[PDB]
Design a protein around this ligand. Structure first.
Ligand SMILES: C[As](C)(=O)[O-]
Ligand SMILES: C[As](C)(=O)[O-]
Ligand SMILES: C[As](C)(=O)[O-]
Ligand SMILES: C[As](C)(=O)[O-]
Ligand SMILES: C[As](C)(=O)[O-]
Ligand SMILES: [Zn+2]
Ligand SMILES: [Zn+2]
Ligand SMILES: [Zn+2]
Ligand SMILES: [Zn+2]
Lengths: 475, 477, 127
C-alpha cells in the first residue's frame, strides 16, 4: 500500500503532479550547490540498488556477464548512472539523456578576505556565469559547498559539504534611488556588487586557528562558521569551494496554481526529471532479461562552455560506455557500431513564451506551460536536433500519449548553445536537443509550469521504455 | 501568569535587553499586514487591547472626552491613524509630544479595470506603480494580492468593506526575459508594456447570471473576482469596488553570518511606524491619565511616498485636527492652539540611509549611520528636513539622559536628498520639528535591510522621548 | 606564464590574487573555465609546496576585467584527468622584450622537480 502510493507520486502512475512538483522544490532547496545535487542523486541511486563504481579502478572485476545497475562520479560534480542488460549487444546501442547540474551562481574567491569598510564585513566573490546583476541585488544569500580538511595528527585530505540554509549569511545591497545617478544600473561586478556578510562589534585568532592553511585567506568569523557546520577544527581546513545562492524556498504559485517558482532551474529541472524517470523505469527492469543499455549522465560547467574534465567535452559518457562494454563482454567491442545505433537526448531547459516580450518569440515555435516536453530546433548548429530526431520524438510521444512543443529563435534574434552538438560529434550518435521550458532563465529565481516536472518525468520514462522500438521504425 | 506578564513587557518594551523578540514581532507584523489598510487595522486592534478608545471623525468629541482625559485614537480613510494620551492636568503651555510617521510603502496597485485579454493563453493583470516600483528589483519576485474590497450584502443597502490577503499564495510574478535573447533582455523596462504581472495559464466555468449582476463584472477577470470574494466570504454579485496591492510575500528574516541584520519588505516607513507605536503602548502602560500633565501622540500618515498632498497624508492635517478637537472637548473653554504648538516637539520619524560600503562615494564622511547603534538624525541645510540646531541639541540631550546613542545623516554637497513630512508638519503647526529615524539599506527596494537590534533600539529611544521630552525641552527656556 | 603585478597599473590586478617576483610558482585560478584549476588541484599544489619547501602565489582576474585562456581546459577535457593551471609570473607578456624575477627560473625548476618527486605520494592523501 505504501510502496504503491510512493510509485504513484514519484512516477505519476495515478496522475498525481502535485507531489512530484513538491519533491522538486524540496530537492532544489535542500541541495543548493552542484556538489549537493550530485550527492543527492548518489544517495538516491544507492537506495534504488545502483552500485557505485570508482573511476580510479578498472571495472572488469566489478561488471560481469549479467550487467546490472551502476553509477560513477567525476570531480564530485559529474555523474553517470547506467543500466546494462545481460542481453545487450553493440547493435542495440545506448539510450542516453544528457543534462547539466551546474547553475549560475556566485563563488567565493580563493581569498575571500576583505578589510572591514566602516565596520561592515564583506567577502570577495566572483560570478560563475552571468550573475551579480540587478536580479542578484536584495536577495537573501546562503553560503555552501565543499570544504577540504585534514584531521589533526593525520595526513589524509577529506571532503565535507556545508550549507547555511535557512540562514542567509549575506546580501548584495542596492543603493537607494534617492541618491540619483549612482543608484542607476548596471553595476560594476568587482567594486559594487559585493556581498555584505556582517557588522561585528567588540574573540581574536587562537594559536591553533593560525595553524590553518586558510588563515589569512578568509575572515576568521567565516572560517569558524564553516568549521562548525562541518564539525571540524579551523586548524584542519585546507581549502574550500563555496557558493552563494538564494535561500528563498521554491513554491507553487499563480492564482490557479499553474506555476512553480524556484531558483536554479537551468538545468536541475531536466536533470531531476531525467533522473527520477530513470529510477522509475529501473524499478520494472530486470537486468537479467534486458537487451538495452540506458543512461542519464549529468555534467558540470555547461554554463561556461563545457570544456573541462567534468563537462560534456570531458567525455564521461563515452568513457562509461567504453569501460562498461569492455568489462561486460571481456572481448573487443565495436564502439562505432554502438554509437551509430544510439539516441542521445540532450535535455536542457528552453524558453517558455513570455507574454510581455512577444517580439522575441517565433510564431508557431514557442512552448507554453503544462503541455509537455519542448524540442529545441536550430538550422545553424546551436542545437543538434535534426529531421529524424524530431520525427522520432514525435513518434515516441504519439505512442506514449505525450504532447510535444517546439522552440526555435526568430531569424533576427539570437540563440544560446547546449551540450548537444558536443555529444553528437564526440560519439557520432544522433542527438536530439529538447527540454522542459521555463520563464526567466538565468534569473536568481525562475518559473515553469506546476505540472511540467511530472510531464517531463512521464516523457523521459516513455523514452527509456520505447526509444529502441520507435527508432527501429526508421531502419 | 504573572511571570508571563512581566516577561511579555520585557520582550515588547526591551526591559531585559531582549532585542531578538521585538525583531521577530516586527517581521511577523510586516508579513501579516502587507497593505496600508492591514497596517492601520493592526495598530487599531493593538490600541483596543491596551484600552485606547476609538473616536469617529464623523461626530463631535465633546461628549467622548472629559476632564479626566484618557487614551484615544481615530482613523481617517482606513489608512491614516492618530493615537493619543491626554492628561487630566495638561494645559496649553505643556504642548504636545508628537511622533509623525507614514504607513504607506512603495507597492503596485491593480488598475480600476485590471482585465487583460489572454495572451497566447497567459492570464495577466493591468496594474500601476505606487511610487518607484515596477523596476528590475520587482522582477522575478513572488507577489501576493491583498487590500480592501467594498461589498453590499444581498437584500441590504449597506456598503461594507473587508480586508483580503493571498499570503502565502503568490498569485503572480513579473517575469524577466532570459538574457539569451540579447538586447531586448537589457533594462530598464517599460512600466506599461513590459512589467506586467502574469497571474495564470488557465485550461478548459463561465460566469453565472448572478455573477454578471456584480458592478465589477467586466472590470476584472472572473477568476480573480471569484478568488477575492472567497477570501472575503462574500458573493461575486455583492462586490462593489476594490483597492488591491501586489506585494512581496517573502517573509522577513534575521540574517548576516552573526545575525546582525534584519531583511524585510516595506521598511520605509513601517519600521519607524511600528517602533513609535510600540513605544507609545509601552509608555502608556505606566501612565495614569488622572495624574499626568502631558499630551502625547503617534500619528500615522498615508501618501507620503507621493508627496503627502491628500486628505489622508500629512498635509491633510489629522494631527492638527486631533489636537484642536481633543483640547476643545477636554477643557470646554477657549484653548490657545498657537501657545500649544509653540511649546510642542514633533519627531518626524522616517527611515534614513545606512552607510552602504559598496557606494562610499555617495555618503558624507562623519554624517552617515551604521547598524545596531541607535536613532539617526536627518540633517539638511536646504529644507529637505525640518531639523534645526535646538532640535539636534534636544535629541542629543535626551539620548545622554536615557542612555541612547545618536547618529547623523546629511547628504554630500554634490549629491541629492529625499524629502519627508517634517517640513510640512513644522509649517502647518508652527512647532519645532525634528527629522530622525531608524536607518536602513536599500530603501525603496522590494526587500530592504536594517540592523537586527534597530527595531528594539528605536522602541527604546521613542519610549525615552515620551518619558522625558518635556523635562529636556524645559532646559532650553 | 601568468602576470606579475605591474605597480603602474594597480587597477587591473585583483587584491590578494597577484604574484610578485622571486617568491615562487603562481597558481592561475578562474571560475569561468579560462583555466582548468579546481579546489582539489589548488590543495594538491599547496600540500606539495609545503612538503618541498616551495612558496605558492595566486593569480585571478578582477570581476570587471578580462582573462586569457591556456591549453589547460583542452588537456583536462581530452584526457579526463585533473589539470592544474600554474606558471612562473612575468611582466609585459606579449611584449617583444619581457621581464621576470632573476630567481624565478631556479624557483620554477625547484618546484617542478618537487612535483615529479612527490606528486604521486601527495595525491594519494586525497584518495
Ligand atoms: C554609474 As554606476 C558604476 O554607480 O552604476
Ligand atoms: C548555456 As545554457 C543553453 O544552459 O543557458
Ligand atoms: C531594450 As527594452 C525597451 O526591451 O528594455
Ligand atoms: C519620500 As521618502 C523620505 O519616504 O523615501
Ligand atoms: C594564449 As596565452 C595564455 O599563452 O597568452
Ligand atoms: Zn543556462
Ligand atoms: Zn541550460
Ligand atoms: Zn520612501
Ligand atoms: Zn520614508
Amino acid at each position: 500500500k505504501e510502496k504503491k502510493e510512493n510509485e504513484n507520486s514519484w512516477c505519476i502512475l495515478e496522475h498525481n503532479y502535485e507531489d512530484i512538483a513538491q519533491e522538486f522544490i524540496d530537492f532544489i532547496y535542500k541541495n543548493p550547490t552542484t556538489y549537493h545535487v550530485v550527492s543527492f542523486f548518489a544517495e538516491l541511486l544507492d537506495k534504488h540498488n545502483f552500485k557505485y563504481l570508482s573511476e580510479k579502478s578498472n571495472w572488469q572485476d566489478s561488471i560481469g556477464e549479467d550487467g546490472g545497475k551502476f553509477y560513477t562520479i567525476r570531480n564530485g560534480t559529474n555523474l553517470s548512472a547506467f543500466i546494462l542488460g545481460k542481453n545487450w549487444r553493440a547493435e542495440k546501442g545506448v539510450g542516453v539523456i544528457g543534462s547539466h547540474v551546474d547553475a549560475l551562481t556566485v563563488k567565493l574567491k580563493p581569498v575571500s578576505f576583505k578589510d572591514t569598510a566602516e565596520g561592515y564585513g564583506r567577502i570577495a566573490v566572483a560570478p560563475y556565469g552571468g550573475t551579480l546583476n540587478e536580479l542578484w541585488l536584495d536577495r537573501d544569500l546562503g553560503i555552501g559547498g565543499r570544504l577540504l580538511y585534514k584531521k589533526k595528527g593525520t595526513n589524509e585530505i577529506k571532503s565535507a559539504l556545508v550549507d547555511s540554509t535557512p540562514l542567509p549569511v549575506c546580501r548584495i545591497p542596492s543603493l537607494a534611488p534617492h541618491f540619483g545617478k549612482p543608484a542607476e544600473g548596471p553595476f560594476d561586478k568587482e567594486d559594487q556588487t559585493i556581498p555584505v556578510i556582517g557588522f561585528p562589534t567588540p574573540e581574536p585568532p587562537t594559536d591553533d586557528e593560525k595553524k590553518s592553511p586558510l588563515f589569512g585567506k578568509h575572515c576568521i568569523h567565516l572560517l569558524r562558521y564553516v568549521a562548525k557546520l562541518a564539525g571540524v577544527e579551523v586548524s584542519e581546513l585546507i581549502q574550500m569551494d563555496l557558493d552563494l545562492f538564494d535561500v528563498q524556498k521554491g513554491t507553487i504559485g499563480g492564482i490557479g496554481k499553474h506555476f512553480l517558482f524556484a531558483p536554479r532551474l537551468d538545468d536541475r529541472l531536466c536533470s531531476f526529471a531525467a533522473m527520477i524517470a530513470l529510477i522509475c523505469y529501473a524499478k520494472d527492469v530486470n537486468t537479467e532479461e534486458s537487451d538495452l543499455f540506458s543512461t542519464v549522465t549529468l555534467y558540470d560547467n555547461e554554463e561556461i562552455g563545457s570544456l573541462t574534465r567534468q563537462g560534456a567535452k570531458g567525455g564521461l559518457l563515452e568513457s562509461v560506455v567504453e569501460r562498461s562494454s569492455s568489462a561486460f563482454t571481456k572481448k573487443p567491442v565495436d564502439l562505432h557500431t554502438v554509437w551509430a545505433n544510439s539516441i542521445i537526448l540532450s535535455a536542457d531547459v528552453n524558453h517558455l513564451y513570455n507574454p510581455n516580450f512577444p517580439e522575441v518569440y517565433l510564431k508557431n515555435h514557442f512552448p507554453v506551460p503544462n503541455v509537455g516536453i519542448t524540442l529545441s530546433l536550430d538550422p545553424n548548429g546551436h542545437m543538434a536536433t535534426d529531421v529524424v530526431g524530431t520525427a522520432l520524438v514525435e513518434e515516441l510521444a504519439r505512442r506514449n500519449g505525450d504532447k510535444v512543443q517546439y522552440f526555435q529563435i526568430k531569424n533576427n534574434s539570437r540563440s544560446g548553445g547546449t551540450i548537444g552538438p558536443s555529444l553528437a560529434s564526440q560519439t557520432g550518435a544522433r542527438t536530439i536537443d529538447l527540454g522542459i521550458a521555463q520563464l526567466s532563465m538565468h534569473s536568481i529565481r525562475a518559473a515553469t509550469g506546476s505540472k511540467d516536472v511530472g510531464l517531463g518525468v512521464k516523457f523521459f520514462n516513455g523514452f527509456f521504455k520505447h526509444w529502441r522500438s520507435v527508432y527501429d521504425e526508421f531502419g
